[PDB]
DNA sequence: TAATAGATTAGAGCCGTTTA
RNA sequence: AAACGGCUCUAAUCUAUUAG
């Protein structure tokens, strides 16, 4: 009695039948499919009755919109009503709704009180109900058929409507100096002194000093900087340049926030040499990485940032690049940095990315945030801040909780 | 908080007019949209490279597993994804026996030869490179 | 180096579907790395090797192994040699089906940093593809879809727009990976799942073309997964749509069978084409189909 | 479409349903009923389906105690309900109640 | 001419179709109008 | 008069293999001289035509 | 012509194969 | 070069500015 029978309209219903038969095949099931079972010769009506009262399990008809009114199929569901009469067996047989150009009212009586399986337009969903229903019915290898019918199952598995909260990479700009001062020093600056080994952040722009600190700050390196008048230096609120309101022949608003941008960038690189870290000088920015041995037991705040893998370690390192475009913010980067012993840089750049790529084998999203944000909340001074120093009275203010994003849609995580 | 919308993953066809979203599992569900009838493969390359390639076609036409198989599908073979066939016994063999040019030229002249001067006709030429 | 893309572009001139393939690939467990474990690991992703191979050899042999579900998509990218502009474009047909073809005769702008088209080569690029797309459809494209990994200067998209037929309002994007976006889940230990998008401004966003899956139950990149900035710089359309439709252009990823690609398949596959043509000398009138190509 | 449907037990209940049926051809409504005009040799559920939803002003539900349950009445009330879903009529659906044995409790949920 | 232009339509077809179409033919058919 | 050769030339440097079919082969029953039996009469060579 | 920055862009290599 | 990603490195260009 362990078999499944699948009448059909025979000319014109042929493939998802063939494509059915084949797949309950494989999954196990006993079918006679009658183009793919029916012997040749042999009488096909007498054979189809011997199949439907003697050994079939459950009859799975097709309700395309050719059929229904077909004369074999309505023969074989009417002796399949009969066997569901004798047999006494709910639902015994299951219709298959393929065709979408037919309606629910218009299927014939045999048949209309049963539910009809959904087939209209996603065979491997429906095919994944009607295995439902045969489960459900228990209707009649053991490592191979398995990944079919996960597959089955599988192959439509979308975003369940859940709210999931997000810790993203940009650290907000909580506060920052009001105002970037340009100080006119025309002639106290040296023509061929760099501007970038100066203690305090600044720019040698149009014969001007743009900087975010005060006139008298760079002295001990600059001496002759002093006794400069104050009327001199130009003045523009920060809040018109990042509002992107204030826009002058004298400076263009690009220009202005590209100015305070690179003056964050530098703020970042004076400020972390004082933070008690190391710095990497990758291709492009550079990173900042604590030694071995500095924090207890190699963690901060429950997240270990320097480790041993084969023999040599590994550290973490962040890189900073403050951008304006959405909000005042700073995008992070993070590294692995590697050393002989967590105190020799290895100066092999080949090697280097080799072993980046070996830690970055293991390490996932819980590990990454984890670091990231141990890293920024280590080089915080307070609780929720770090101070870069572009000014002795004013300083830039990086918040410790990044950009938190929400979402409507999200998943199930596997175990 | 700034709210991450969601983008849907599109849908591709397959046969039958059946639409899914990873190929590896709408191939095998179905297979692919139009019919060809086989591949008659051209390999240009060494001896061993014409025996390399003979042996991963024939254990390609049978289902081969990954180490994982719920992340990355399995593949059922060839003939069972596809409907078509690739045997490695209809293969036509060319053997070989600046220097980035030359490389080049000796695959070219036997590829444009074998298109041009013999009549086995191939649809994709494998050009099993050494290492 | 430039042994596979001179090869094909010799191979060219006489339309002949090559497939490269690497003795080590086939065979990966004989070579080894002289001190143990091959120097190729294939033993995870066999199946999937199999698969991209099976793919790869049914799209060259003439088969369509995957479709897509009145606008032409043309991806163009920039080339290093003079620079060249080397497009891609992609449709639907009257038939239901996804004319993939390409868009080449690298076009030749003679700035050595300008990654921008001259209006004479943006004229010819732009009416390349819409006599293209007007053979092949019948009727000109409602709005085409041009997009690039650079934005478009003021002379070219003035080009484009004066090139334009009437009726077709042209939207131009800039697709830029590497952008650091790094967002992390806090809860869970596995990355953002694929298809969220961040709409950080009416014309610009980030896509996650890529991440985490609910499908296969891992992610399609390792590690953190990187969001791709999507900015309409030039024409008028709206996020959404533009972003749905990069989602549906990272599905025809032909030369591969994998879920889906961190980029949208169009600017990849005209980078490979123009990898090819400048790879070796100049070609009339080139295939112009990734079967030859890729 | 202009037809009346009777719809019953077909053993049991046959008495009432062929009176009322003869009284509503002699009052000149034209009339369907399975052991009446269901002829010989005919595919029945074939040519029941195709009068319900082909020519049917009205059908009516014999609401006996087994006939209520009865299998062929439920698959004919079904279609019933579909026909009467498509042609929007008022009031296409008419139970008959003829047994003081079963109460209204008893009759089966969809006719209540 | 007219023969050169006859066969031109024809040929150009065939290298459009052998160069831009995806799917493959193995041979030509010209059914050639009477 | 010279369609076929011309056609078969200027196919063979992209090499393609081309077969010209008249019309008038293939349905050669539709074709009919104006006053009778078809120009090409097949009937008697059909299956050695389609060989 | 050289330098100092930020923003874009392109090129190549190099490693891992996506936590069950 | 089956392939896709993460990273690493390099170079160039466009602005603005300073020294030639
Ligand atoms: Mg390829």
């Given at each position: 009695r362990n078999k499944i029978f699948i009448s059909h309209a025979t000319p014109e219903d042929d493939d998802f039948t063939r494509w059915l038969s084949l797949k309950l095949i494989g999954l196990g099931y006993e079918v006679w499919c009658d183009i793919l079972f029916?012997?040749?010769?042999?009488?096909f009506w007498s054979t189809i009755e011997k199949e439907i009262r003697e050994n079939t399990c459950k009859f799975l008809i097709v309700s395309s919109?050719?059929?229904?009114?077909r004369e074999g199929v309505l023969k074989e569901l009417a002796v399949a009503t009969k066997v569901k009469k004798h047999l006494?067996?709910?639902?015994f047989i299951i219709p298959l709704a393929?065709?979408?150009?037919?309606?629910?009212?218009?299927?014939?009586?045999?048949?209309?009180?049963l539910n009809a399986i959904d087939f209209k337009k996603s065979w491997a969903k429906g095919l994944q109900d009607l295995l439902d229903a045969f489960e459900k019915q228990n209707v009649p290898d053991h490592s191979k058929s398995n990944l079919l019918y996960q597959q089955i199952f599988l192959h439509d598995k979308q975003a369940i409507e859940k709210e999931e909260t997000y810790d993203s990479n940009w650290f907000p700009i909580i506060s920052f100096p009001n105002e970037l001062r340009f100080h006119?020093?025309?002639?106290?600056?040296?023509?061929?002194?760099?501007?970038?080994?100066?203690?305090f952040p600044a720019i040698r722009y149009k014969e001007y000093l743009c900087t975010?600190?005060?006139?008298?700050?760079?002295?001990?390196?600059?001496?002759?900087?002093?006794?400069?008048?104050?009327?001199?230096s130009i003045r523009i609120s920060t809040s018109d340049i990042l509002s992107g309101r204030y826009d002058t022949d004298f400076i263009r608003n690009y220009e202005c926030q590209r100015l305070i941008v690179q003056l964050i960038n530098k703020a970042f690189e004076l400020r972390m040499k004082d933070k008690n870290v190391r710095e990497y000088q990758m291709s492009k920015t550079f990173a900042y990485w604590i030694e071995k041995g500095?924090?207890?037991?190699?963690?901060f705040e429950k997240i270990k940032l320097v480790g041993k893998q084969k023999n040599k370690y590994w550290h973490f390192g962040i890189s900073a690049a403050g951008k304006l475009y959405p909000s005042p913010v700073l995008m992070v980067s993070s590294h692995i940095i590697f050393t002989m012993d967590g105190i020799n840089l290895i100066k092999s750049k080949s090697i280097q990315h080799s072993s980046r790529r070996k830690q970055g084998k293991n390490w996932w999203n819980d590990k990454w945030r984890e670091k990231l944000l141990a890293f920024i909340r280590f080089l915080s001074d307070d609780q929720n801040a770090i101070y870069l120093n572009?000014?002795?009275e004013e300083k830039i203010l990086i918040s410790n909780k990044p950009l938190k994003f929400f979402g409507k849609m999200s998943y199930v995580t596997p175990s | 908080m700034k709210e991450l919308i969601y983008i849907e993953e599109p849908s591709i066809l397959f046969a039958h007019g059946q639409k899914c979203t990873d190929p590896r599992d709408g191939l095998a569900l179905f297979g692919p949209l139009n019919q060809i009838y086989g591949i008659k493969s051209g390999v240009v390359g060494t001896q061993k490279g014409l025996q390399i390639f003979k042996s991963y076609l024939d254990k390609i036409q049978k289902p081969i597993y990954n180490?994982?198989?719920?992340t990355r599908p399995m593949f059922p073979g060839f003939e069972a994804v596809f409907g078509c066939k690739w045997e490695s016994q209809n293969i036509v063999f060319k053997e070989i026996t600046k220097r980035t040019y030359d490389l080049v030229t000796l695959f070219n002249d036997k590829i444009i030869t074998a298109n041009k001067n013999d009549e086995e006709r191939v649809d994709v030429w494998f050009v099993i490179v050494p290492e | 180096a430039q042994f596979h893309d001179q090869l094909k572009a010799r191979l060219l001139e006489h339309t002949i579907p090559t497939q490269i393939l690497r003795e080590s690939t086939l065979?990966?467990?004989?070579?080894?790395?002289?001190?143990?474990?091959?120097?190729?690991?294939?033993?995870?992703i066999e199946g999937h090797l199999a698969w991209t191979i099976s793919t790869a050899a049914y799209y060259k042999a003439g088969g369509k192994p995957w479709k897509l579900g009145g606008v032409c998509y043309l991806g163009l990218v920039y080339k290093k040699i003079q620079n060249a502009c080397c497009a891609a474009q992609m449709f639907l047909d009257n038939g239901d089906?996804?004319?993939?073809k390409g868009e080449v005769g690298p076009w030749y702008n003679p700035?050595?940093?300008?990654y921008h088209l001259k209006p004479k080569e943006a004229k010819a690029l732009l009416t390349q593809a819409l006599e293209s797309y007007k053979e092949q459809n019948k009727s000109y494209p409602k709005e085409v879809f041009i997009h690039a990994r650079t934005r478009f200067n003021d002379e070219e998209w003035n080009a484009f727009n004066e090139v334009t037929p009437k009726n077709t309002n042209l939207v131009g994007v800039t697709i830029t990976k590497?952008?650091?976006?790094?967002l992390y889940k806090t809860?869970?230990?596995?990355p953002i799942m694929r298809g969220n998008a961040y709409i950080v401004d009416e014309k610009k966003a980030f896509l996650w073309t890529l991440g985490f899956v609910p499908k296969l139950?891992?992610?399609?990149?390792?590690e953190v997964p990187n969001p791709i900035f999507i900015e309409i710089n030039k024409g008028e359309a709206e996020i959404q749509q533009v972003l749905k439709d990069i989602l549906a252009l990272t599905?025809?990823?032909?030369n591969a069978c994998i879920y889906?690609?961190?980029?949208p398949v169009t600017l990849r596959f005209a980078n490979k084409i123009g990898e090819i043509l400048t790879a070796s000398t100049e070609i009339k009138?080139?295939?112009?189909?990734?079967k030859y190509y890729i």
């Amino acid at each position: 009695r362990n078999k499944i029978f699948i009448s059909h309209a025979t000319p014109e219903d042929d493939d998802f039948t063939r494509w059915l038969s084949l797949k309950l095949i494989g999954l196990g099931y006993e079918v006679w499919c009658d183009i793919l079972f029916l012997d040749k010769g042999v009488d096909f009506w007498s054979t189809i009755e011997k199949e439907i009262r003697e050994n079939t399990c459950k009859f799975l008809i097709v309700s395309s919109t050719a059929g229904n009114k077909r004369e074999g199929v309505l023969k074989e569901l009417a002796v399949a009503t009969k066997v569901k009469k004798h047999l006494q067996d709910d639902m015994f047989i299951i219709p298959l709704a393929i065709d979408e150009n037919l309606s629910y009212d218009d299927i014939n009586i045999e048949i209309v009180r049963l539910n009809a399986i959904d087939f209209k337009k996603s065979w491997a969903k429906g095919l994944q109900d009607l295995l439902d229903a045969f489960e459900k019915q228990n209707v009649p290898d053991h490592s191979k058929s398995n990944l079919l019918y996960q597959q089955i199952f599988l192959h439509d598995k979308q975003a369940i409507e859940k709210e999931e909260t997000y810790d993203s990479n940009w650290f907000p700009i909580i506060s920052f100096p009001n105002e970037l001062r340009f100080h006119r020093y025309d002639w106290r600056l040296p023509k061929q002194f760099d501007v970038r080994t100066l203690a305090f952040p600044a720019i040698r722009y149009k014969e001007y000093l743009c900087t975010f600190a005060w006139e008298y700050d760079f002295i001990h390196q600059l001496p002759k900087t002093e006794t400069y008048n104050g009327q001199e230096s130009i003045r523009i609120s920060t809040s018109d340049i990042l509002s992107g309101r204030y826009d002058t022949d004298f400076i263009r608003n690009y220009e202005c926030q590209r100015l305070i941008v690179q003056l964050i960038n530098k703020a970042f690189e004076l400020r972390m040499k004082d933070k008690n870290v190391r710095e990497y000088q990758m291709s492009k920015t550079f990173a900042y990485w604590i030694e071995k041995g500095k924090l207890e037991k190699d963690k901060f705040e429950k997240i270990k940032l320097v480790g041993k893998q084969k023999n040599k370690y590994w550290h973490f390192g962040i890189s900073a690049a403050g951008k304006l475009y959405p909000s005042p913010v700073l995008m992070v980067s993070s590294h692995i940095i590697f050393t002989m012993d967590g105190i020799n840089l290895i100066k092999s750049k080949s090697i280097q990315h080799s072993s980046r790529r070996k830690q970055g084998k293991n390490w996932w999203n819980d590990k990454w945030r984890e670091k990231l944000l141990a890293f920024i909340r280590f080089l915080s001074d307070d609780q929720n801040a770090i101070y870069l120093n572009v000014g002795s009275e004013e300083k830039i203010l990086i918040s410790n909780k990044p950009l938190k994003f929400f979402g409507k849609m999200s998943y199930v995580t596997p175990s | 908080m700034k709210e991450l919308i969601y983008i849907e993953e599109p849908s591709i066809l397959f046969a039958h007019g059946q639409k899914c979203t990873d190929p590896r599992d709408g191939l095998a569900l179905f297979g692919p949209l139009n019919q060809i009838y086989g591949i008659k493969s051209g390999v240009v390359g060494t001896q061993k490279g014409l025996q390399i390639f003979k042996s991963y076609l024939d254990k390609i036409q049978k289902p081969i597993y990954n180490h994982n198989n719920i992340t990355r599908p399995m593949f059922p073979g060839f003939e069972a994804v596809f409907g078509c066939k690739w045997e490695s016994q209809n293969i036509v063999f060319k053997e070989i026996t600046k220097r980035t040019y030359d490389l080049v030229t000796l695959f070219n002249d036997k590829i444009i030869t074998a298109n041009k001067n013999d009549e086995e006709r191939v649809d994709v030429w494998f050009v099993i490179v050494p290492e | 180096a430039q042994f596979h893309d001179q090869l094909k572009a010799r191979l060219l001139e006489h339309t002949i579907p090559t497939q490269i393939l690497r003795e080590s690939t086939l065979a990966w467990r004989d070579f080894k790395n002289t001190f143990g474990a091959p120097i190729r690991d294939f033993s995870k992703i066999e199946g999937h090797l199999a698969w991209t191979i099976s793919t790869a050899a049914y799209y060259k042999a003439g088969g369509k192994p995957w479709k897509l579900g009145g606008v032409c998509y043309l991806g163009l990218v920039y080339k290093k040699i003079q620079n060249a502009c080397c497009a891609a474009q992609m449709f639907l047909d009257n038939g239901d089906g996804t004319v993939f073809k390409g868009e080449v005769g690298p076009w030749y702008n003679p700035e050595k940093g300008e990654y921008h088209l001259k209006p004479k080569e943006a004229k010819a690029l732009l009416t390349q593809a819409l006599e293209s797309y007007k053979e092949q459809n019948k009727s000109y494209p409602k709005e085409v879809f041009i997009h690039a990994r650079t934005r478009f200067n003021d002379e070219e998209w003035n080009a484009f727009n004066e090139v334009t037929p009437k009726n077709t309002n042209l939207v131009g994007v800039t697709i830029t990976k590497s952008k650091p976006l790094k967002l992390y889940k806090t809860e869970g230990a596995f990355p953002i799942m694929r298809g969220n998008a961040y709409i950080v401004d009416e014309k610009k966003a980030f896509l996650w073309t890529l991440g985490f899956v609910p499908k296969l139950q891992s992610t399609l990149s390792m590690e953190v997964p990187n969001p791709i900035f999507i900015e309409i710089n030039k024409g008028e359309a709206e996020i959404q749509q533009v972003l749905k439709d990069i989602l549906a252009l990272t599905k025809l990823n032909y030369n591969a069978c994998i879920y889906a690609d961190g980029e949208p398949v169009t600017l990849r596959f005209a980078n490979k084409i123009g990898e090819i043509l400048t790879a070796s000398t100049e070609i009339k009138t080139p295939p112009l189909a990734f079967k030859y190509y890729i």
